[PDB]
Amino acid sequence: DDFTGCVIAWNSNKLDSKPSGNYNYLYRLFRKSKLKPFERDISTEIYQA
Amino acid sequence: KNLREFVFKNIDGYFKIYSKHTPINLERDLPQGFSALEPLVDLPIGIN
Amino acid sequence: VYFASTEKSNIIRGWIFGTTLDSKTQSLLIVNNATNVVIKVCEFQFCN
Amino acid sequence: QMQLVQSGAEVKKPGESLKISCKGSGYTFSYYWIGWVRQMPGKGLEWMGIIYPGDSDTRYSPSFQGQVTISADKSISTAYLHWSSLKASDTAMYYCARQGDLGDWILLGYWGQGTLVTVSSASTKGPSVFPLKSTAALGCLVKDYFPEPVTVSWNSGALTSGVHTFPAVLQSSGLYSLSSVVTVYICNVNHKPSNTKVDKKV
Numbered sequence: 001d002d003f004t005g006c007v008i009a010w011n012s013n014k015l016d017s018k019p020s021g022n023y024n025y026l027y028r029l030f031r032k033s034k035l036k037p038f039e040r041d042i043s044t045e046i047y048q049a
Numbered sequence: 050k051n052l053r054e055f056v057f058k059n060i061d062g063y064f065k066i067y068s069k070h071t072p073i074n075l076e077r078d079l080p081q082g083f084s085a086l087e088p089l090v091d092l093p094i095g096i097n
Numbered sequence: 098v099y100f101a102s103t104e105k106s107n108i109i110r111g112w113i114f115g116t117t118l119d120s121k122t123q124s125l126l127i128v129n130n131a132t133n134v135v136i137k138v139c140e141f142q143f144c145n
Numbered sequence: 146q147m148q149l150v151q152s153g154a155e156v157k158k159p160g161e162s163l164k165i166s167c168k169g170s171g172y173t174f175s176y177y178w179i180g181w182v183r184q185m186p187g188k189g190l191e192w193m194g195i196i197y198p199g200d201s202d203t204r205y206s207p208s209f210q211g212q213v214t215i216s217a218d219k220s221i222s223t224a225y226l227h228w229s230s231l232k233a234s235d236t237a238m239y240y241c242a243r244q245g246d247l248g249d250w251i252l253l254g255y256w257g258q259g260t261l262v263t264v265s266s267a268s269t270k271g272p273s274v275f276p277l278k279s280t281a282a283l284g285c286l287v288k289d290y291f292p293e294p295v296t297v298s299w300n301s302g303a304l305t306s307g308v309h310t311f312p313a314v315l316q317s318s319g320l321y322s323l324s325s326v327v328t329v330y331i332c333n334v335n336h337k338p339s340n341t342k343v344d345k346k347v
Contacts, residue, residue: 038062
């Protein structure tokens with residue numbers, strides 16, 4: 001909540017996308033708890049729902 | 050005898066380290082008084 | 098965690114930080130010696 | 146099947162500002178980055194730039210920011226190369242490349258067939274054909290030609306078995322000389338840079 005700085009975002013459909021599907025990008029959808037500010041979770045263990 | 054103190058804090062993904070040494074007599078450990086620790090190392094780790 | 102030590106000849110030479118400490122998540126490791134210190138966060142398989 | 150072809154070879158004088166084109170098919174030529182790669186005779190590959198056919202966004206190498214421009218036409222799926230103020234050091238083999246579905250957008254997946262470009266002031270001197278103890282084999286001789294891409298055939302291409310072509314040799318007068326033989330006949334020499342076809346019988 002006390003973040004100070006700038007966030008720079010732009011369209012990258014011509015770089016990070018392919019007609020056959022650019023599957024090299026992954027996102028975490030399930031997790032036991034929410035992430036803290038500036039936290040990283042690279043674990044790939046199967047989440048028990 | 051030399052006494053060493055350290056403080057390890059991890060807030061908002063940044064790991065802060067404080068360190069300061071104070072020579073104390075051989076009477077006992079952790080004597081009374083105050084000794085402020087100075088920050089030396091600050092680095093982000095982003096881990097839990 | 099506040100750390101304090103008074104052992105002669107600096108017997109202690111580092112600390113370990115992590116959440117699971119079995120190479121399942123990134124974990125911090127601090128090594129200290131007479132020449133240079135190495136601070137590195139990795140997926141260490143820490144021993145007993 | 147996806148195919149990628151370029152224009153034919155050309156040879157012009159310094160300062161004529163020739164143009165090379167590329168034609169692609171078999172895929173959507175709006176999402177794959179297409180570019181070109183320069184290769185001078187004797188050295189390695191030198192990338193010049195790429196262009197995204199979906200829009201006017203272009204990227205060029207720092208060593209080719211103004212030496213060469215790259216354009217494309219999405220309506221006909223055709224790319225183009227243009228130069229200005231040609232010099233003697235501009236002669237090189239140009240290979241086109243496309244993104245492809247193999248890797249990232251910057252990785253070149255497929256390649257064309259190549260287009261030879263020669264820049265000189267010889268004005269494309271015309272060649273000369275001459276025929277060549279064998280009993281057996283026959284052959285012919287080509288002399289007094291400046292351009293390198295000279296092709297020689299036998300009986301309009303009807304004879305392919307036993308045909309062998311030896312590399313060209315540069316004479317002291319500044320002209321090359323090649324010779325082709327056939328195992329046993331009219332040898333057909335076609336000088337594409339000058340459109341001069343000479344038929345000679347052994």
